[PDB]
Amino acid sequence: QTNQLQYLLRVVLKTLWKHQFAWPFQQPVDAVKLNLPDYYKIIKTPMDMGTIKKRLENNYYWNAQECIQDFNTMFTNCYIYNKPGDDIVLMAEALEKLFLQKINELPTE
């Protein structure tokens, strides 16, 4: 799924990364800085777009599904850990929508 992994890097990641709401998702959740003592107990698989970018760039993925899985994990972590209405959740939701739009245009192969 190299064409799809190219799509995930150059179209999907590129678009989300440049978004005004990307910045809390560009690096791993800083639970120290953010005073989230429980984060690294409740969240079993931390994920962020910074990590996904590195995976796309360093030939981590064997197929596009694994990458789409990572994006989903990142959004899920946000939705299972955060409070409905809070800015972080409103930000995750707008990114997820753009993500899903770009994923529905995923090139065949």
Partner: peptide, 10 residues
């Protein structure tokens, strides 16, 4: 549980 304001307001 990460309750910080993030989104700029006017």
């Amino acid at each position: 549980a990460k309750r910080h304001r993030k989104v700029l307001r006017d």
